[PDB]
Design a protein around this ligand. Structure first.
Ligand SMILES: C#CCN(Cc1ccc2[nH]c(N)nc(=O)c2c1)c1ccc(C(=O)N[C@@H](CCC(=O)O)C(=O)O)cc1
Ligand SMILES: C#CCN(Cc1ccc2[nH]c(N)nc(=O)c2c1)c1ccc(C(=O)N[C@@H](CCC(=O)O)C(=O)O)cc1
Ligand SMILES: *c1cc(=O)[nH]c(=O)n1[C@H]1C[C@H](O)[C@@H](COP(=O)(O)O)O1
Ligand SMILES: O=c1ccn([C@H]2C[C@H](O)[C@@H](COP(=O)(O)O)O2)c(=O)[nH]1
Lengths: 264, 264
């Protein structure tokens, strides 16, 4: 996508070499925002083939409030296996925070039902937020949340979403996240009988790892193609009842996949 | 300031009319970002006169862990009175979350001291974050956090900060908020012997209130004057040790004040 390849080049041209936690090295910038008008097409990168199976099962996993990779496993998704403990868990990661944030006094708050009731009952609210950054449980988490925080907005019947991402690996993880949250805005918009608007991505430390340098070069030389269109094939009676079969992506003619090693 | 005045012009050129919680009516855009290089000058608006007494005092109150207005009152700062209860209390807002976020296992996390340890011992961390958005306590808060989350970053011995403001009142609140976080970056950097980098502001619902349209156009007709300079006269043993008197702003000549109503 033009904005995405412009962020790749930006990093390449201005990033500073930093030693990172892995000991691989990064080239990074701090502060970047991208806007994707969703009316114009689905933001799935077309300069490399992106595979939806993982994107979709991971979002449905999250909305279930499940932090154990068994479902993911049962659906052939491997992305979280490195971080999961001895018997499948990640501790209170994304889905537990989304569906059951623990109050200090023992109650649990369901930020996705809150956000649903806010979109139907109070759509002009300036507080339609879901936060995964639970400072009090970060220590029990296999990995601190990368896509930490997000905010919805309604104006002239359209639903927009801004995501704050504290840490971003441009080559591998950024295409994944952009699509994931663009997909949640379409699910969220359908349930609330609403139009889709903008997806705004904002990042903190945005970086390209030293061993993805050739792959970036290879991806930057390809021309972006027309964006696909997402088809949602049936309306559930809740956001919690969507299934993998419900989604279809028409128009996606990508350049071939580029493989690149993960720095863990 | 060029950046601030361009944002106001943008809200005026691209905003949608939206009704707010206080029913006064706003003009809003969703998603903006702007960067202020702190080496260029101290970002206090000059197209209208700002009073620095309250920017410093509120920030020391926050760093104290305080959420009761009495301190602010004896330094006659009345910016928080409209929201405080009978006993001066605001409930667990900024100062309490920053200095003692309550966990579900009995602990409390001092997020400012943690940030300082990270800048000293692990400055390349992508996790140097302070969040006031505590979902399990928002119902005890007198007002939900508008400046909800901020991230620090250290590159070439320069400290930068990125603030995410979920709701922004552009005429009243935003000159207060930019000056407050630029102060904290200078204080942090002084304590850690770092130079100042950039303060990067990102907003969610960024808006102008309807009863502010004339004051905004008045402001916009003015030329920015050269930015002031911040001189700190002491290096306190800790960041919790600063006094009002340790700060001096040099060469600040603003255009006349412009007065305007608060929506409560
Ligand atoms: C992001 C995320 C979830 N994850 C992992 C993952 C890792 C660290 C994290 N760290 C943090 N802070 N939060 C997370 O949500 C998180 C998630 C991913 C893992 C691998 C690939 C990946 O290598 N993609 C390959 C192909 C495989 C595929 O299609 O799945 C590629 O070529 O793109 C993508 C996403
Ligand atoms: C941000 C922030 C902190 N705050 C708290 C705070 C809380 C709720 C809010 N609600 C709304 N609608 N807008 C805000 O800017 C806002 C700000 C402020 C409170 C008042 C003023 C204000 O009226 N100041 C006068 C100056 C005179 C004085 O010192 O009293 C002004 O004309 O600007 C500014 C900031
Ligand atoms: C809140 C906090 C601050 O210091 N600065 C701000 O600009 N605000 C503003 C935003 C909005 O005008 C109002 C809060 O209303 P709501 O909670 O968003 O509904 O104060
Ligand atoms: O949604 C995601 C998930 C992970 N990552 C990457 C960012 C960093 O490369 C790493 C997170 O590690 P720390 O920043 O906590 O060190 O995973 C992303 O870019 N996006």
């Amino acid at each position: 996508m033009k904005q995405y390849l412009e962020l790749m080049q930006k990093v390449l041209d201005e990033g500073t070499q930093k030693n990172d936690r892995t000991g691989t090295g990064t080239l990074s910038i701090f502060g970047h925002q991208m806007r994707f008008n969703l009316q114009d097409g689905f933001p799935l990168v077309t300069t490399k083939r992106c595979h939806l199976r993982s994107i979709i099962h991971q979002l449905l996993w999250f909305l279930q409030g499940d932090t154990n990779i068994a479902y993911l496993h049962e659906n052939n998704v491997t992305i979280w296996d490195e971080w999961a403990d001895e018997n499948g868990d990640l501790g209170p990661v994304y889905g537990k925070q989304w569906r059951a944030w623990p109050t200090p006094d023992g109650r649990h708050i369901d930020q996705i039902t809150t956000v649903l009731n806010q979109l139907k009952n109070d759509p002009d609210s300036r507080r339609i937020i879901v936060s995964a950054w639970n400072v009090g449980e970060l220590d029990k988490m296999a990995l601190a949340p990368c896509h930490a925080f997000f905010q919805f907005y309604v104006a002239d019947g359209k639903l927009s979403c801004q995501l704050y991402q504290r840490s971003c690996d441009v080559f591998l993880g950024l295409p994944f996240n952009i699509a994931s949250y663009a997909l949640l805005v379409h699910m969220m918009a359908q349930q609330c009988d609403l139009e889709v608007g903008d997806f705004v991505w904002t990042g903190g430390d945005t970086h390209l790892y030293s061993n993805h340098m050739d792959q970036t070069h290879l991806q930057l030389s390809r021309e972006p193609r027309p964006l696909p269109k997402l088809i949602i094939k049936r309306k559930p009676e809740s956001i919690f009842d969507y299934r993998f079969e419900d989604f279809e992506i028409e128009g996606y003619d990508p350049h071939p996949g580029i493989k690149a090693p993960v720095a863990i």
